[PDB]
Design a protein around this ligand. Sequence first.
Ligand SMILES: *[C@@H]1O[C@H](CO)[C@@H](O[C@@H]2O[C@H](CO)[C@@H](O[C@@H]3O[C@H](CO)[C@@H](O)[C@H](O)[C@@H]3O)[C@H](O)[C@H]2NC(C)=O)[C@H](O)[C@H]1NC(C)=O
Ligand SMILES: *[C@@H]1O[C@H](CO)[C@@H](O)[C@H](O)[C@H]1NC(C)=O
Ligand SMILES: *[C@@H]1O[C@H](CO)[C@@H](O)[C@H](O)[C@H]1NC(C)=O
Ligand SMILES: *[C@H]1O[C@H](CO)[C@@H](O)[C@H](O)[C@H]1NC(C)=O
Lengths: 572, 166
Amino acid sequence: SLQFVFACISYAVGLGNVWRFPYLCQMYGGGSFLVPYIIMLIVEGMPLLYLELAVGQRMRQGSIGAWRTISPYLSGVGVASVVVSFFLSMYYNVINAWAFWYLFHSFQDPLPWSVCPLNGNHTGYDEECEKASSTQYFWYRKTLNISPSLQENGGVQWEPALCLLLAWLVVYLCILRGTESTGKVVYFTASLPYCVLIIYLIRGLTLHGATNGLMYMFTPKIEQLANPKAWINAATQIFFSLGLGFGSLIAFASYNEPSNNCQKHAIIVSLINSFTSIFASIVTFSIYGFKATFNYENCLKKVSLLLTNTFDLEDGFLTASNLEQVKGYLASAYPSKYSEMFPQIKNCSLESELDTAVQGTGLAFIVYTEAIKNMEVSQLWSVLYFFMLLMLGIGSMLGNTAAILTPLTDSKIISSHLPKEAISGLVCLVNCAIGMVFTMEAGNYWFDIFNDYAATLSLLLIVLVETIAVCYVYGLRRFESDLKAMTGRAVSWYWKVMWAGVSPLLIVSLFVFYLSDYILTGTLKYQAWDASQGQLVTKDYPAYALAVIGLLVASSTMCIPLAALGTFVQRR
Amino acid sequence: FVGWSTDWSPYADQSIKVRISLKSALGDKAYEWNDNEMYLFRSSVAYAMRQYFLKVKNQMILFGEEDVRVANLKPRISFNFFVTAPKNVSDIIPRTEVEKAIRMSRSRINDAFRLNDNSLEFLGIQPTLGPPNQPPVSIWLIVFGVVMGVIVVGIVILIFTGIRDR
Ligand SMILES: *[C@@H]1O[C@H](CO)[C@@H](O[C@@H]2O[C@H](CO)[C@@H](O[C@@H]3O[C@H](CO)[C@@H](O)[C@H](O)[C@@H]3O)[C@H](O)[C@H]2NC(C)=O)[C@H](O)[C@H]1NC(C)=O
Ligand SMILES: *[C@@H]1O[C@H](CO)[C@@H](O)[C@H](O)[C@H]1NC(C)=O
Ligand SMILES: *[C@@H]1O[C@H](CO)[C@@H](O)[C@H](O)[C@H]1NC(C)=O
Ligand SMILES: *[C@H]1O[C@H](CO)[C@@H](O)[C@H](O)[C@H]1NC(C)=O
């Protein structure tokens, strides 16, 4: 019936493809990132997803159990499947906290991101809130209070810490309460995000100059298309959105009937996830194009006002459509006055704005707040959208935490020492203690680091190990025979070829390209807020941050080889 | 210094510069700025001066439209005006008093031409937007406290029921 479709939609639609995907798309030029994602979908999404589902269905065990049954000296990879997930639980719930924050400041008629604060004379506006948008100022100063550089970090901000604690308490409450009622919750928690996105798409399409963002997002600029970073980010983003590497898919497939259809399920899940990501990107980039058009018009209006004031022209004489001609006439009339203010004139174009209108890890928040502030009843739409985002994040965190706790629940030794319910509380407390780091003044930089590298290489390596083990260790023919015995209609040659020599080769090639690019450039930099310019400036990563990122990647990557060496020693 | 400059004028020290942007504030349906509009503006300035001299210094000075002298008129509608004594040309009201008078009654001048503090700039008189009123303590804190309380109550009751069942 429709219950299965709703469950598939709920498993496919999450906070990931709604939040992380638009930011990655904006960072890597839009279309130049959109094209690989579709390419990385039909090559890596469906085949690997179907492989994981088939393994979970055939093995009838958990991730650790399945990867131990496949091979002893490989069982440690299952442990890695938890560790990476743990790192996700380290930071992902922090996003929910931000949602809570943006929810809590949604019951005021003077919305905090709607009107800039006064400078102090009650005559103008703050310099930071004037150079930057009101939403940007509220996000970077009144919400994150971000430091200009990563080197200087302040104390733990109390309000974000309280928001994070509330988010963890909500997660723990949902863990304790919700165990099998989700079938009813699927009737409501699967269609609301689509309705919210439809409403926001309508609002964006009703805004002036919104088609520019849609054109930008669909424009495949070949100059930035050759960047291996875009391919790597698309691959890790689709792997994260589909849940590959986390092992939750295997656990879910182990709970289904042996005769349950898997190819149709995997294809439907992948296609729904891709379509939802594309739709969210469409809406977000429509609002982003609206912002870029507004900034371009504001810059042109400021330039025209400055020229009119300093050359005493008529109010309506100078317009955007005839700017350069009037500039040439002024230069030809008296070049002395024109040159007296030539450096003050600023050249602003739609391309530059669309490149650097809004960027960073909080692109979705800023963009949707801008969309909200131009509504009719801003509070209602703000509350609805933030509640939808919070629900999606809660569902994603519930899935991640269940995947983490399942191997711990299966641990007989741990179960016999402590109550099963107290394990969830201990895990939540530890995760909150670890994630309190993100609540500092410079916690946004660490959040960006853990969103860029704590799941980039780890997921790729885990998927590569899994597909190598399936294709060559266990034997492709044996797996195909087992699947045919279980359900019939053996895998077509397309799936066999993809599992044998397409996906692993592409993953290895992408990893080699990324490593070569990193070695050649050697200039891994991060964006940092600049209140003086009211923008984002690239700054080189410090030694300690690079070491921390390297350690975070290395632990997840070496979780499997260390256990393999231990198993080899035990056998020997 | 041998020579002279063609910019200095004896009335430049006490002159207040007005810049008017009718097209930006009104878009369409914008009236033309002929001499009648200048007469109306001078009358409004004289009225503001009368109001300041009556309600602050308690002096009845009969200003007129001919006591607001205007110079350097431009197509931008940008000029310099200064107010003299009612019948003493050699007496020019100091710029501080004129600025205080304009600040006192800028709303009437703004409404006379349907302009709002951005299309009628006096270049030295900076308007005040107004202090932003704040909630009693915090709406967000109250909502957060209520949500945290209900969540804690739910957690406690669920834990108690689970313990009692087993
Ligand atoms: C028109 O306004 C001007 C001011 O701009 C008036 O000039 C002022 O006239 C008074 C009366 O004579 C002057 O006071 C006297 O100054 C002399 C200077 O040596 C002093 O010796 C006297 O004891 C007395 O204090 C005042 O200085 C003068 N101010 C200026 C700036 O010239 C003028 O009287 C007004 N005309 C009329 C008809 O009211
Ligand atoms: C606000 O008042 C102070 C008073 O010292 C002044 O320095 C500052 O320039 C004023 N702000 C603006 C925007 O003029
Ligand atoms: C704008 O273009 C002119 C044309 O050469 C250039 O000289 C100037 O540096 C550019 N930037 C600004 C801010 O004027
Ligand atoms: C701004 O403040 C000044 C004095 O502080 C006051 O006269 C003026 O009316 C205010 N403007 C408003 C409240 O719009």
